[PDB]
């Protein structure tokens, strides 16, 4: 009999379930995801001055292993280390290895500076090995010199070499200490004498005494220190020292990515992990708790759906 006007709201056939403070199964017209589950299998290096090290291990850059020849110097904002990267062409390790790697991967480039170190004619500087191949012929670490007596068996002359840091910023000096297995090898190369190697600056001081991998029990182990601006560092040795021909300077800061995934200069990103890039605009992710850069926060959630619409009541 009477005219009538009704107020109402829309609905949809297919609604989505979300969670509220009171209801675990609340159907609404529209929701959206807040946790990212998908990852790009590539490293998005667009608009980044990057350096993919490939088979070069960051420490190899400072001592100059063959593999790292293309990476002895440069400038970057991003540094990408790879799996099973090579630091040591001749068997050995660096003391405080991990601390050094982390320091290089925070760097935004590397300058090299000549020590200027010269040696008496009774010394052989360019001592090489079949382990470190370069131009398909026996070679050695580019930034170090293998110091051995020129006459096989002759006792090694007492030498003193000293680097001073002329620069206004700290310099990273590395050096090696050869320890052969057999007394026949040591006498042949350095002489019968007791060997002692003393290194000293204002900051640092240390003494070293030379004591089967690739068929060799003989090692070259590496040590490192920072040498302050204006300060000097002196090396006293009677043989067995692998001497720095160059010191390293780490410049500015850079993002260090450890990833097996391939480069792509077409795509951009500020967040990376082992398995690649994360360009999601979402505020959370559940891919990995180990990420680097500006990133969504890791959460222990497959999905968290955010209602973008009213309750859905069909019929």
């Amino acid at each position: 009999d009477p005219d009538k006007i009704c107020l109402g709201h829309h609905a949809v056939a297919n609604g989505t379930i979300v969670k509220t403070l009171t209801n675990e199964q609340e159907e609404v017209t529209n929701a959206t995801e807040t946790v990212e589950s998908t990852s790009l299998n590539r490293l998005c290096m667009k608009g980044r001055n990057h350096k993919d090290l490939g088979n070069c291990h960051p420490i190899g850059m400072l001592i100059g292993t063959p593999a790292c020849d293309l990476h002895l110097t440069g400038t970057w904002d991003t540094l990408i280390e790879r799996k099973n990267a090579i630091a040591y062409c001749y068997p050995g390790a660096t003391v405080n290895e991990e601390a050094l790697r982390q320091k290089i991967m925070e760097s935004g480039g590397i300058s090299k500076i000549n020590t200027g170190f010269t040696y008496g004619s009774s010394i052989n500087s360019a001592g090489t090995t079949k382990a470190c191949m370069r131009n398909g012929g026996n070679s050695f670490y580019a930034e170090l010199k293998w110091l051995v007596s020129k006459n096989k068996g002759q006792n090694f002359p007492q030498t003193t070499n000293t680097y001073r840091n002329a620069d206004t910023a700290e310099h990273l000096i590395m050096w090696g200490i050869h320890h052969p297995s057999s007394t026949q090898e040591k006498n042949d190369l350095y002489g019968t004498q007791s060997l002692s190697i003393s290194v000293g600056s204002s900051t640092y001081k240390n003494n070293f005494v030379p004591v089967q991998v690739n068929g060799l029990s003989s090692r070259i182990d590496f040590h490192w220190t920072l040498v302050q601006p204006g300060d000097k560092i002196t090396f006293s040795h009677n043989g067995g020292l692998i001497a720095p021909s160059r010191v390293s300077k780490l410049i500015g800061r850079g993002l260090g990515i450890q990833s097996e995934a391939p480069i792509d200069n077409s795509c951009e990103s500020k967040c990376f992990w082992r398995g690649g890039s994360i360009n999601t605009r979402l505020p959370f992710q559940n891919l990995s708790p180990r990420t680097v850069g500006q990133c969504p926060k890791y959460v222990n959630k497959k999905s968290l759906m955010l209602a973008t619409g009213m309750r859905n009541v069909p019929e």
């Binding site: 009477p2 005219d3 009538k4 006007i5 009704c6 107020l7 109402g8 709201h9 829309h10 609905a11 969670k19 509220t20 403070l21 009171t22 609340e26 609404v28 959206t32 807040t34 946790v35 280390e81 799996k83 099973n84 990267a85 290895e97 991990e98 982390q102 991967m105 993002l255 260090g256 450890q258 990833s259 500020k270 082992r274 605009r281 505020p283 959370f284 708790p289 180990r290 680097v292 850069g293 500006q294 990133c295 969504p296 926060k297 890791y298 959460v299 222990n300 959630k301 968290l304 759906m305 955010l306 209602a307 973008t308 619409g309 009213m310 309750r311 859905n312 009541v313 069909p314 019929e315």
Partner: protein, 172 residues
């Protein structure tokens, strides 16, 4: 619901209404008609947009590695990192679960509020010339042509014009 409009005195929504979130259905001499309310629809959508702009983002903070993917790190500092990182993940998982849950509760109730707010606007407009059937409809106690309906929806309906006709029809 907090406001009892949506999933309340309004028995259900309209799958048929695809030009808006809130709107009207009338029935007069001329026949039946449906139309969306823009202002009330936009009000709800703008508030939800607002939430999305705030919630869909990450921080500016650049985080470096403290765990090597390819090499062992000291066992003791590693356990400290593991404990810290797990403790942080617990927080962010909680903070995320709470945020979304609390926003969801609000998004819903907000939309409810916007429906009730339209109903109350109409109710007050019709004044003494109509009565609530309790299903979200107003039984209008006078001849309301399509121009009269468009006048309710466009907030131009002058109650005084139909008052005398309506009050008679109502008291009978």
């Amino acid at each position: 619901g907090l406001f009892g409009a949506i999933a309340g005195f309004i028995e259900n929504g309209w799958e048929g209404m695809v030009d808006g979130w809130y709107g009207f259905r009338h029935q007069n001499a001329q026949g039946t008609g449906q139309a969306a309310d823009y202002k009330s629809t936009q009000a709800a959508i703008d508030q939800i947009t607002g939430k999305l702009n705030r919630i869909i983002k990450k921080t500016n903070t650049e985080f470096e590695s403290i765990e090597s993917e390819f090499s062992e790190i000291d066992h003791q500092i590693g356990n400290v990192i593991n404990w810290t990182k797990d403790s942080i993940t617990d927080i962010w998982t909680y903070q995320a679960e709470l945020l979304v849950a609390m926003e969801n509760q609000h998004t819903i109730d907000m939309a409810d509020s916007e429906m009730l707010n339209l109903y109350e606007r109409v109710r007050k407009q019709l004044r003494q010339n109509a009565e609530e059937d309790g299903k979200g409809c107003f039984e209008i106690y006078h001849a309301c042509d399509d121009s009269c309906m468009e006048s309710i929806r466009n907030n131009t309906y002058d109650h005084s014009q139909y008052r005398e006709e309506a009050l008679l029809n109502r008291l009978n």
